[PDB]
Structures are given as C-alpha cells and as structure tokens.
Amino acid sequence: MDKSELVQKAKLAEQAERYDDMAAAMKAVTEQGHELSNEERNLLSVAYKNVVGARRSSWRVISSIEQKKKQQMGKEYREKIEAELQDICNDVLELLDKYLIPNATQPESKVFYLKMKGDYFRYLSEVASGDNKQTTVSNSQQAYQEAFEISKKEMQPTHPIRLGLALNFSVFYYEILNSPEKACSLAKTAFDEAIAELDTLNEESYKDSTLIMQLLRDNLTLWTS
Amino acid sequence: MDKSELVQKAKLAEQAERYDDMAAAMKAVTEQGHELSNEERNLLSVAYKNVVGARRSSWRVISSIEQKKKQQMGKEYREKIEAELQDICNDVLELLDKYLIPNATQPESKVFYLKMKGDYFRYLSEVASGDNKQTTVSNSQQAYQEAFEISKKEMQPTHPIRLGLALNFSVFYYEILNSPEKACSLAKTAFDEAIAELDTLNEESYKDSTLIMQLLRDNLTLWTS
Amino acid sequence: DKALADGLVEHFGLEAEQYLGEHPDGPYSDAEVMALGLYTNGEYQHLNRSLRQGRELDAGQALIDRGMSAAFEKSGPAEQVVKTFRGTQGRDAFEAVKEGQVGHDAGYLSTSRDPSVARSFAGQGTITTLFGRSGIDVSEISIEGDEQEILYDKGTDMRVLLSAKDGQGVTRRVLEEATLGERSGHGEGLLDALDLAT
Amino acid sequence: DKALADGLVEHFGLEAEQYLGEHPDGPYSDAEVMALGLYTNGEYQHLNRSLRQGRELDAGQALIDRGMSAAFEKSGPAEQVVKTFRGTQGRDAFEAVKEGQVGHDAGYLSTSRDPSVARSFAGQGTITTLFGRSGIDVSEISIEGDEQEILYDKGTDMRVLLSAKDGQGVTRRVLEEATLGERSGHGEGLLDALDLAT
Ligand SMILES: O=C(O)CCc1nc2sc3c(c2c(=O)[nH]1)CCC3
Ligand SMILES: O=C(O)CCc1nc2sc3c(c2c(=O)[nH]1)CCC3
C-alpha cells in the first residue's frame, strides 16, 4: 500500500463511520516510519479518539448502573470493556513512543503528541487498579507538564494546541487527582496569559482558539460554585 | 447462563450502545429452543436491526462515492462490507428458520418474524450478484406474501404488525423489484382497508399505528410525483 | 348551589325535570344532572352554534354552559384511555391543525363510542375518532338512539395524529387529548422492533 | 458627484482640502477622500456620538456620513481576514450581546491594527479585537499617531466570539463580521483532533 492509498482508505472509514477500520488504517501510515503531516496527524487522533470515546461512553454507563440482585456478571461485563480500553491506549502509546514522539521534527506537533500521550495515560488511569493505577498517572503528568514548558516557552499563548493542552491538564487534576486546587490554579494562569495577549491570535484559527477559552471560563466558575 | 440472566446482559449492550454484543446476546436466548416473549422478541429485532442498519448506512455511502483515479480498492473495501451483511442476514435467517419460525405458537408473532425474514431476504438482495441476486428475492416475496394473507385473513387492519408489513412490502417493490406499479398498488389497498375501519384501533397502540399510516400516505403521493 | 338547580326549573320546567333521579351513584349534583341532560340531546346544537362564532349566549344556555363546565373539574378524569367517535356535515375545527400538533375547539365535544352513530350523525362529511379520559360518561342520563355518549370540555386541546381523506371523500381523522401526548399509547418498543424505510 | 465634493469645500474649506491628493491609486472619488479623512481623525467623535443616541445630524456631519457610507459599497471587500483592534472608556455596544450571537453598532467602527493604540485609545475600559474585510483601509489618508486604521460600516453585525473580564477588570473581547461565520477561521479539523472534556 502506497503512503497515499491509505489516505483514501482512511478517509473512507471516517465517512463510513467505521472507525475501528480507521484505527488500523491510520495505524499503518505511522508504521511507515516517516513523519505525517497535520492532515494525517488530525485524522489518526480523530480516529482513535472516536473509538476510545465510544468505549468510554459505553463503559461510563455500566459504572453508573452497578453503583445505582446480582451485579457481579455486570462488573464481569464492565471488565471486558476495561480490557478493551487498556488494550487500546497502551497500543497507541507505543505508536506514540515508536514512530510519533521521535519523528516530531516540527515544534508544533512536539506538543500535540505529548498532550495526546498524556491523555491516553489519563484515559487508562480510570479503569486501572493497584499496579497500573499509580504507574499510569506517573507518566501522565510526566508527558503533560513535559509538553507544557514547550507550550510555555516556545508556543504562543493564544495557540490552539497550547490552550487545549491546558484544558485537558486542568481536567486531569479535577478528574484523576481529584485536586481542584491546582486544576483551577493551572487554568486561570493559562487563561490569564491568553487574554493579556490578544494580538497573539492567528487568523487561520482565530475562531478555533476562542472556543477553547470559552471552555476554561466555564470550568473555573463551575469548579468554584 | 439462565434464561433471565441474559435479559439483563442484553439490556446492557443496548444502553451501552454495544449492539454487536447485543447480537450474540439475544442470539443465545433464542438458541435456548424455547419461545420468547414480545419483550425479548422486540429486543432481538432492535439488536440485529441497529447492527445491520449500521453496516447498511456504512455500505450505502461507499456505493455513492465510487459512482460519484483508482477506485478498485474502494470497491474492494465495499466488498468486505458486503461480506459483513451477507454473513449477518443468512446467520439470522437460520435463527429465524430454526428456533423462531416453528416456535411461533402465538398468531401475532407469526407475522412479525415472517415480515422480518423477508426483510433480511430484502436486505441481502441489494449486495448480491447473480447466483444469490435472483435466489434471495424468491424467498423474499415468498415470506412476505406468506405473512400477508395471515395479516389479511387473521390480523386486524389497523394493527401495528400488519400495517408495518405492508410498508416494508411496498418499499420492497419500489426498491428491489423497482416496480412502483404494484408497490403503490399494495399500499393504497392496505391504507384504504385501514381508514374504513377506525373502530379497529387498540388503545394500547392507537398512536403507534397512526404513525405507520402517516408514512404510507407519504409514500403513495411521493411515488406519484 | 340549589339556586342554579332552580335556574333550570325557572326556565325549562318539565323539560329540565325530565332528568333528575337518573343517578344510581351521584358524583354530580342535582343541577349537574339536568344541565348535562339538557345539552346531550337535544338542546345543545345551538349551545355550540353560539359558542362557536363567538356569539352571545341565551338566557337558558348561559345557565347550562356554566353548570356544564363546572361539573368537569367535579367529574374528570379516570381511569384509562377511551375510544369515542364523532362525525359531521363537513367543516370540523381540526381541519386547520397541522398533523402532529395540538388544537382545541371553541364549543364542546359531544361524542359516541358506537361506530354506527359515528357513520354518521348529520352528516357524513368529516368523521373522527377520539382518545382521552376528561370526558363525562353520560351514557346513562341521555342515551337517545342508544348512543352511549362521553362528552369532553371545550377549550380542551386535541392532537391530530392523522388526517386523510377517503376514496369517496369522507375525511376520517384521529385525535388525542393534549395532556396525554408523548408515549401515551405506544407498544413498548414494538415500533423500534419493526424496522422500516422512512 | 462633484456637488458633494463641493459640499465640504463649502463648509470646511482648508480643513476639507487637507486631504485630496492623498491617493496614489484612486478606488475612491475626490469627495470620498476628504470625507473619510474628516472622520478618521479627528472630526468623528461627534459623528458617532450623534449617530448613537439616535440624535439628529449637523449640517457638515450629514454631508460626511452620506459620503462615507457611499464609499463602502464602492470599497469593500477583499481580500482575506484582517486583525483590527479597538479600546474604549467603558460601555461598548456589544456588552448586551449573548456570547456566540451577532450584533451591530449604531454608529461606525473605527479601529486600528496596532496593539499599542489598542491599549488604549481613551480609555482602557473595554478593549476589543476584530476580524473582517469590509473595512476601509485608510492607513494612508489619516494616520495620526501612526495608527494604520481600517474602518468598517455602521449597522455591520459582529459575532461576539468571546467576552471575559481582566484581572484588573479591563473587558477584553473578540468579534467577527456577520458575513464570515460558521467555519471562517477554523483549523481544518485541528479542533476535532485535540480531544477534550466539555
Ligand atoms: O354541534 C356540535 O357540537 C358537533 C356536532 C356533533 N354533535 C354530536 S352529539 C353526539 C354526537 C355528535 C357528533 O358526532 N357531532 C355523537 C354521539 C352524540
Ligand atoms: O467613538 C467611537 O466611535 C468609538 C471610540 C473609538 N474611536 C476610535 S478612532 C480610532 C480608534 C478608535 C477606538 O478604538 N475607539 C482606534 C484607531 C483609530
């Protein structure tokens, strides 16, 4: 398969809403060992997200009914979903660590992937237990704050990747570490650093960034009420 | 697994929106060899439908792009979807013919299943080619008209199963046989036989039946314009 | 309120007294029995012909309407959905409602559960078939022609579930009381399980 | 229309003639140059103070506004999205618009692309940053203080993409011309690819 044939087949599974195909689809273009443009960089992330978010929306419901007469076989069924996500993230984290993280020649994608890698460490940290429960979070903040200084010292404040990295980080503290103290602490800092420099917006994604900011202001106040 | 444990696990895959699990889930309660109540009769049909309709919505898009420079590997990808549906319907038609059709003690379900069996013969008739192309349609009208006389001579006119069987039949002629002459011919007959007897409505599904009638009037005129 | 009960015996007399002990049990009052009887059949065609067109009431008819609408809260509802019917000489107050929406008459809604009086009752222009509870089971006070009547209020809103026209051109229609709505009268998931085209 | 061009030389004189040959190329007329120059800086604060409040115009200002709005269709748009700025002494005509919706001023919309004149230009109450094309690049006719100005019309509708308030309480805001909207200024799928909480 040519480096461009899979592009079409990858776009197919998306429009066909067959992202499990899109999973292995964009998996191959990165297994080519060559850097991928933002076009493909977007598709792969869009692929695995919709897949993981799908199992996520599936798992999150079971974890509400069992809490809310046998329910062991319900946990046993929830376990096979846990088994699915665990298999997914750790699979994609190797794809991050093998062909994505080092190939990051461009400084922009140097933050998108690390943000994504921390997300999939943030994803796995929910269904985990004991051994991985503490371990997954260690690399989570590791990869998170790692890209943050890059976003801090190199990236513009009002930049889509930087602002998104701050949100997912602010969500990681409130959700994972259940520490809204530092969660709210990191958003305002990022939020404040954004409004002071409004001339830092790019017309290419001027509207794209504002939406992100509209979310953080709707998380600070939300957490403080 | 008890005949009632799978009920809960079947309801799980539905709420979890994991119908591929729901496929094999309700597959087992019918493999028990005992008759299934309308509650389970509804779930299984709801299960395989959402699955087949999902692959259907997937396949129908590819069959628009290829029609609308290589596209062989696109047909090759469309072929694996064809392979999916073929595997599905013929699998469920055996489940119809083995544990569903004979177990039909109740006269009501005697029309729901045959209607469904003709649907899955109607489903397979689209992706087929040559050998099965003509063969699948033979049992399609067979099972269709078979339940129709049952619906005609035994079922009330304004009955949900009867009115639905007429629609899917009217859609089968316009879509499959591409013969809107008899398609429109069968709907009006059924439609007319419905409005004359309005005292034939049951309060249990009085609103459910009207919706069906609202569809046929929106298919006659549509086909005649 | 005996004064209201006297209002009919001061204005109709033996006519109003025609209905009185028409009551084994009595969820209704003396004045409520004679009033409902006076409408039902047949002193009622002009109670709605005057309600509709926004026209002014007569002496006695004002004494009726007020006694009638009063008994409604005192009567409705209970207990499950019923299946009344109603035909007309054309022009019903539901021909302007869009299919799937809710609309209410100006006047009242006399009906019957017998499909024969349904087709018809002067005339066979527009035929309907209703569903609800807030109707007054007067199938005891005035069953002229053995119509077994159930009567709903006036500004009660109805959901036009279907509006078609016959081969011979008699517009048969389905209706439904507003306060039912949504999944009031749906086979539990039978619809989703049919699978259709749409 | 030379008569309009005379209107300023019959009412402003050497003031109106201050701007004239301020034009290498000339997509605008003689009357269009002097009019835009008269507004820009500084005979303009009362052109909007009178537009707003719905108040009546003066003699000369009516001669300006009509010459100004005329040049708009004769000028706009082309060619890509720009990044102007605008600060105020508090109370801007976009504080009542809900976030995500579109609203238009009564008066005009003088702006600047220089972030310094952005913070500020009497005063530092409410600060904004705009996006569009239908603005008149007057960064040649009147660049007092080297402001490099671009001026939009009046009833031009703006989409409040963001409205927050600063730590020190200066309300910084983002805006966007109505006729852009939807996916006008979005990274092609970069958003969907980030994955978020929401
Ligand atoms: O005049 C009206 O208010 C509607 C016409 C009308 N009146 C009556 S009375 C009655 C019925 C009826 C009707 O169908 N229409 C059916 C059983 C007893
Ligand atoms: O009075 C008004 O119409 C709004 C106040 C206001 N006027 C002006 S003129 C000008 C600017 C400006 C402004 O930011 N506000 C910025 C560069 C040149």
Domain ranges for chain C, please list them.
Answer: 1-75, 77-182
Residue of A nearest to B64 (CA): A16
- Residues C150, C191: contact at Cβ < 8 Å? no
D and A touch per CB criterion (3+ pairs under 8 A): yes
Alpha-helical (H) ranges within D101-169 are 115-118
Q: CB-based contact (8 Å) between A28 and chain B? A: no
Distance A24 CA to ligand 1 centre (A): 69
Closest approach of D94 to chain A, Cα-based (Å): 16
SS (H, E, C) A89-125: HHHHHHHHHHHHCCCCCCCCHHHHHHHHHHHHHHHHH
User: Cis peptide before D123, with omega less than 30 degrees from 0?
Assistant: yes
Rounded to whole angstroms, the Cα distance separating A118 from A137 reads 9
* Nearest to B19, CA basis, from A9, C182, A58: A58
In the numeric block, the tokens 């989570």 are attached to A140
Q: Do B57 and A12 touch (CB under 8 A)?
A: no
Rounded to whole angstroms, the Cα distance separating D164 from D127 reads 10
Rounded to whole angstroms, the Cα distance separating A99 from A96 reads 6
CB count, 10 Å around CB of D41?
17
Rounded to whole angstroms, the Cα distance separating B127 from C96 reads 45
From the list C29, C75, C110, C142, the catalytic residue is C110
Q: Do A74 and B15 touch (CB under 8 A)?
A: no
D and B touch per CB criterion (3+ pairs under 8 A): no
**DSSP labels for D65-97?**
HHHHHHHHHHH---SS-B--EEEESS--TTSSS
In the numeric block, the tokens 């939020």 are attached to A191
Determine how β-strand D171-174 pairs with β-strand C150-152. Answer: unpaired
Structure tokens at C164: 């078609």
- Out of A12, A54, A59, name the one closest to residue B62 (CB): A12
Closest approach of B116 to chain C, Cα-based (Å): 8
Q: What are the strands, taking DSSP E only, across D97-193? A: 102-104, 109-110, 126-129, 136-137, 150-152, 157-159, 162-163, 171-174
Rounded to whole angstroms, the Cα distance separating A101 from A222 reads 34
User: SS3 of D151, please?
Assistant: strand
Instruction: Decide: C171 in ligand 1 pocket, CB within 6 A.
Output: no
3-state helix, strand, coil in chain D (%, to 5): 30, 15, 55
SS (H, E, C) chain B: CCCCHHHHHHHHHHHCCCHHHHHHHHHHHHHCCCCCCHHHHHHHHHHHHHHHHHHHHHHHHHHHHCCCCCCHHHHHHHHHHHHHHHHHHHHHHHHHHHHHCCCCCCCCHHHHHHHHHHHHHHHHHHHCCCHHHHHHHHHHHHHHHHHHHHHHHCCCCCCHHHHHHHHHHHHHHHHCCCCHHHHHHHHHHHHHHHHCCCCCCCCCCHHHHHHHHHHHHHHHHHHCC
DSSP single-letter state for residue D132: B
Instruction: Assign domain D77-181 to a CATH class.
Output: alpha beta
- Among C180, C190, C192, C198, pick the best mutation site for testing chain B contact (most B Cβ within 10 A): C190
Q: Any catalytic annotation for residue C149?
A: yes
- Residues C4, C67: contact at Cβ < 8 Å? yes
Q: Do B62 and A9 touch (CB under 8 A)?
A: no
Q: Measure CA D55 to chain center.
A: 20
Q: How far is CA D175 from CA A164, D78, D99, D162, in A?
A: 21, 19, 10, 7
- Among C111, C163, C194, C198, pick the best mutation site for testing chain B contact (most B Cβ within 10 A): C194
Q: CB-based contact (8 Å) between A156 and chain D? A: no
User: SS3 of D138, please?
Assistant: coil
Atom of ligand 2 nearest to the CA of D114: 17
Instruction: Decide: C107 in ligand 1 pocket, CB within 6 A.
Output: yes
Q: Measure CA B37 to chain center.
A: 18
Rounded to whole angstroms, the Cα distance separating D140 from D150 reads 10
SS (H, E, C) C100-158: CCEEECCCCEECECCHHHHCCCCCCCEEEECCECCCEECCCCCCCCCCCCEEECCCCEE
- Out of A41, A201, A215, name the one closest to residue D83 (CB): A201
Q: What one-letter code names the amino acid at D140?
A: E
In the numeric block, the tokens 């005949």 are attached to B3
Name the experimental technique.
X-ray
Rounded to whole angstroms, the Cα distance separating D169 from D166 reads 4
Angle at D104 between CA D101 and CA D110, to 5 degrees: 125
What resolution in angstrom units was achieved for this structure?
Answer: 3.8
Q: What is the CA radius of gyration of chain C?
A: 18
From the list C29, C32, C75, C86, the catalytic residue is C86
Closest approach of A14 to chain B, Cα-based (Å): 10
Structure tokens at C128: 């309907």
User: Cis peptide before A157, with omega less than 30 degrees from 0?
Assistant: no
- Out of D172, D184, D194, name the one closest to residue A164 (CB): D194
- Out of A16, A62, A65, name the one closest to residue B62 (CB): A16
Closest-CA residue, ligand 2 atom 16, reads: D111
User: SS3 of A138, please?
Assistant: helix
Instruction: Assign domain C77-182 to a CATH class.
Output: alpha beta
DSSP single-letter state for residue D104: E
Rounded to whole angstroms, the Cα distance separating A118 from A166 reads 12
User: SS3 of A24, please?
Assistant: helix
Q: Do B167 and C191 touch (CB under 8 A)?
A: no
Closest-CA residue, ligand 1 atom 1, reads: C45
Q: What one-letter code names the amino acid at C91?
A: R
Distance D48 CA to ligand 2 centre (A): 10
Instruction: Select from C40, C64, C109, C121 the residue to mutate for testing ligand 1; criterion: most ligand atoms less than 8 Å from CB.
Output: C121
Rounded to whole angstroms, the Cα distance separating B114 from B128 reads 21
User: SS3 of D128, please?
Assistant: strand
Q: Do B205 and C131 touch (CB under 8 A)?
A: no
Query: Backbone phi, then psi, for D178, in 5-degree steps?
Result: -55, -50
- Out of C186, C188, C198, name the one closest to residue B207 (CB): C186
> Each residue of B174-198: b (16+ CB within 10 Å) or e?
bbbeeebeebbebbeebbebbbbeb
DSSP single-letter state for residue D28: S
In angstroms, how far is the first alpha carbon of chain B from the final one? 54
Give domain B1-225's CATH number out of 1.10.1760.20, 3.30.1330.10, 1.20.190.20, 1.10.3720.10.
1.20.190.20
Determine how β-strand C162-163 pairs with β-strand C171-174. Answer: antiparallel
Atom of ligand 1 nearest to the CA of C112: 17
Q: Any catalytic annotation for residue C86?
A: yes
Q: Measure CA B183 to chain center.
A: 17
Please, which contacts does B152-156 make with residues 24 or more away whose CB atoms are closer than 8 Å? Answer: B154/B107, B155/B107, B155/B108, B155/B111, B156/B197, B156/B200, B156/B202
**DSSP labels for chain C?**
-HHHHHHHHTTTTHHHHTSSS--SS-SS-HHHHHHHHHHHTTTTHHHHHHHGGGPPP-HHHHHHHHHHHHHHHHH---SS-B--EEEESS--TTSSSPTTSEEE-SS-EE-BS-HHHHS-SS-SSEEEE--BS-SEE-TTT--TTS---EEE-SS-EEE--EE---TT--EEEE--BTTT-TTTT--TTHHHHH----
Rounded to whole angstroms, the Cα distance separating D121 from D125 reads 10
Determine how β-strand C162-163 pairs with β-strand C157-159. Answer: unpaired
Distance D179 CA to ligand 2 centre (A): 22
